[PDB]
């Protein structure tokens, strides 16, 4: 077999679901960008220390039952340091420096790309790319339940400083805090 499948680029290439957002009958949900959200794609990045990667995002909107309704939604990106919107009618949604993507539910999922946002040369896992904001357009509530899922790919993977993997299960989100053996056991030494 060739070396193309085991390469660093193809190991982070496959897409995954990094978020789940549900809007009951609120109107707006602010979700912070994090790659540590789920167990998968997390253990993989702790193998390395320094990582430099572009971010590709996918916005998929639907209802709880799956049917699509012709309703217009707004997808806004908030750069690091910018104030977060406190409501739907607030000033943060009319801000010119916050890019927006206007898509409908019948509109197939839009794809946006986020360049490298860190002031340093690479990320340090041992990382805030900003936050999102999403609301339904109009000054009135929308009588439809919106449940959306965000897909995230990784483009132009760069890796440095390979680190040993973590055998113990994760405790908290921001810290790698009953020790467990990393391997199974057997009754004797000479047994197979």
């Amino acid at each position: 077999h060739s070396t193309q499948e085991t390469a660093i680029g193809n190991f982070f290439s496959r897409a995954g679901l990094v978020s789940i957002i549900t809007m009951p009958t609120d109107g707006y949900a602010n979700w912070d960008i994090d790659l540590m959200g789920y167990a998968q794609l997390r253990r993989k990045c702790e193998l390395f220390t320094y990582m430099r990667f572009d971010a590709e995002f996918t916005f998929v909107v639907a209802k709880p039952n799956g049917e699509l309704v012709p309703q217009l939604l707004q997808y806004m990106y908030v750069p690091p340091g910018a104030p977060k919107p406190t409501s739907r009618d607030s000033f943060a949604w009319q801000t010119a420096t916050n890019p927006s993507v206007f898509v409908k539910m019948t509109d197939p999922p839009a794809q946006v790309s986020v360049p490298f946002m860190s002031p340093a040369s690479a990320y340090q896992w041992f990382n805030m790319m900003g936050t999102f904001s999403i609301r339904t357009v109009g000054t009135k509530k929308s009588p439809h339940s919106i449940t959306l899922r965000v897909y995230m790919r990784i483009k132009h993977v760069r890796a440095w400083i390979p680190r040993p993997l973590r055998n113990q299960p994760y405790l908290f989100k921001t810290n790698p805090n009953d020790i467990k053996c990393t391997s199974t056991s057997r009754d004797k030494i000479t047994t197979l």
Partner: antibody, heavy 109, light 107 residues
Framework: EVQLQQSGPELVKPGASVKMSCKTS????????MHWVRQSHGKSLEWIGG????????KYNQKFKGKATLTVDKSSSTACMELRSLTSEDSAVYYC????????????? | DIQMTQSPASLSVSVGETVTITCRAS??????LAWYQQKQGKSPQLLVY???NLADGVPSRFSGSGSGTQYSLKINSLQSEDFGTYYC?????????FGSGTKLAIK
């Protein structure tokens, strides 16, 4: 039988604060939510705010953002409300009502 | 902002007649409306919610109706225990703005 008992009225100097608390009984507190309603003179009703003690998360009226402050105690199954910077027109009647099941809709019985 | 008022200011209906009361809303909730019974010196209680279903302790004499931005409450017939005022409720968006209130009398 669901019963919510409030405290007694108090005399507050304008500019000071006030402590309003009413205990809950007859049901399970933490699964449901809490709300507050102010009755202004002569006859009017207004929704102060609500608290759902699973997080805790809350929402208030636009005018009460800088006045009303809510907190809950799940040990004694009571709900508390704080009001500051009282003025001459702030004299009114308050109510203690229990909301829906993880919902603020479904009008309170 | 969401805003609504009732009409008319006050009514007078004796025992055994039909009461027609309405509260109009500016926007359209499509779903939820509630009516409260508040006497002198006592707290309100729930009567009819969602413009259709009625709460416990309420007899069949109270029936709601209406759709869209036009709602109504039909009382047939009136009894001597129904004295008090009525309000309206809107779940459409926060904050909730209640009704202005309407007083009842006996002709």
């Amino acid at each position: 039988e669901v019963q919510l008992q409030q405290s007694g009225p108090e005399l507050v100097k304008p500019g000071a604060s006030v402590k309003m608390s009413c205990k809950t009984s007859g049901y399970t507190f933490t699964e449901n939510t809490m709300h507050w309603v102010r009755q202004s003179h002569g006859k009017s009703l207004e929704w102060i705010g609500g608290i759902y003690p699973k997080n805790d998360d809350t929402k208030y009226n636009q005018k009460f953002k800088g006045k009303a402050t809510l907190t809950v105690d799940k040990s004694s199954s009571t709900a508390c409300m704080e009001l500051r910077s009282l003025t001459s027109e702030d004299s009114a009647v308050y109510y203690c009502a229990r909301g829906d099941y993880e919902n603020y809709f479904y009008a309170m019985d | 902002d969401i805003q609504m008022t009732q009409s008319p200011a006050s009514l007078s209906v004796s025992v055994g007649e039909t009461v027609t009361i309405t509260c109009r809303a500016s926007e359209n909730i499509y779903s939820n409306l509630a009516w409260y019974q508040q006497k002198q010196g006592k707290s309100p209680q729930l009567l009819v919610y969602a413009a259709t279903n009625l709460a416990d302790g309420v007899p069949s004499r109270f029936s709601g109706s209406g759709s869209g931005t036009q709602y109504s409450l039909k009382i047939n017939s009136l009894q001597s225990e129904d004295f008090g005022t009525y309000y309206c409720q809107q779940f459409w968006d926060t904050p909730f703005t209640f009704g202005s209130g309407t007083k009842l009398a006996i002709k």
